Design an enzyme around this catalytic site. Structure first.
Site: not given
Ligand SMILES: CC(C)(C)OC(=O)N[C@@H](Cc1ccccc1)[C@@H](O)CN[C@@H](Cc1ccccc1)C(=O)N[C@@H](CCC(=O)O)C(=O)N[C@@H](Cc1ccccc1)C(N)=O
Lengths: 99, 99
Positions: B25-27
């Protein structure tokens, strides 16, 4: 281009006449964009991520330019914190993961 | 290897003596694994994704084998739907996005 992952893989996209920054997300099946001005019809839809689910408006066959590469596909618009370009569009611009 | 994105980029990882499948997951900035048996001490932490926030446990300098490449780093364990390998470990195995 080749993008390394020391920094978030953010790119410039153009959609609906507007310029925005978006995250290339291999872990997303779909492309989800923050609330925005999009013309056309749309059908409701709920999606899930880590955290739970959000409701979004689904727009089909939307033109989008990702880092200069054009693609047409489904785009979802809702309460997402960041603009996410998912696999549905990443395949369209021939994006691969490599190691 | 080179991985295209027509299907979820699922790979085999070995962590804590156990074999599991995880999504590249690059995201994701972090690596988040479903509830599992891990040894050692851990700190509490809150993380957000699309959907909202989950509480996880933070383990540092953990050894993880991803598709055969070893890496040592922070792994988070909590109520996530899927095992997610984030950028903190993807950079370590020299993974890049290409298009
Ligand atoms: C976008 C969507 C179509 C709804 O798919 C997913 O959510 N896919 C996720 C995988 C998955 C597959 C099947 C079922 C469930 C989940 C993942 O790839 C999503 N990538 C990003 C999407 C995203 C980014 C930013 C905001 C909202 C959403 C993510 O959650 N990234 C998280 C991954 C978990 C983590 O690293 O802790 C992240 O980097 N979060 C950071 C940044 C952040 C802060 C605050 C709020 C949101 C995000 C963090 N440290 O909390």
């Amino acid at each position: 281009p080749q993008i390394t992952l020391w920094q978030r893989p953010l790119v410039t996209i153009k959609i609906g006449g507007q310029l925005k920054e978006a995250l290339l997300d291999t872990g997303a099946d779909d492309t989800v964009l923050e609330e925005m001005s999009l013309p056309g019809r749309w059908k409701p839809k709920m999606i899930g991520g880590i955290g739970g689910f959000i409701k979004v408006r689904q727009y089909d066959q939307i033109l989008i330019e990702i880092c200069g590469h054009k693609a047409i596909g489904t785009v979802l618009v809702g309460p997402t914190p960041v603009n996410i370009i998912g696999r549905n569009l990443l395949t369209q611009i021939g994006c691969t993961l490599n190691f």
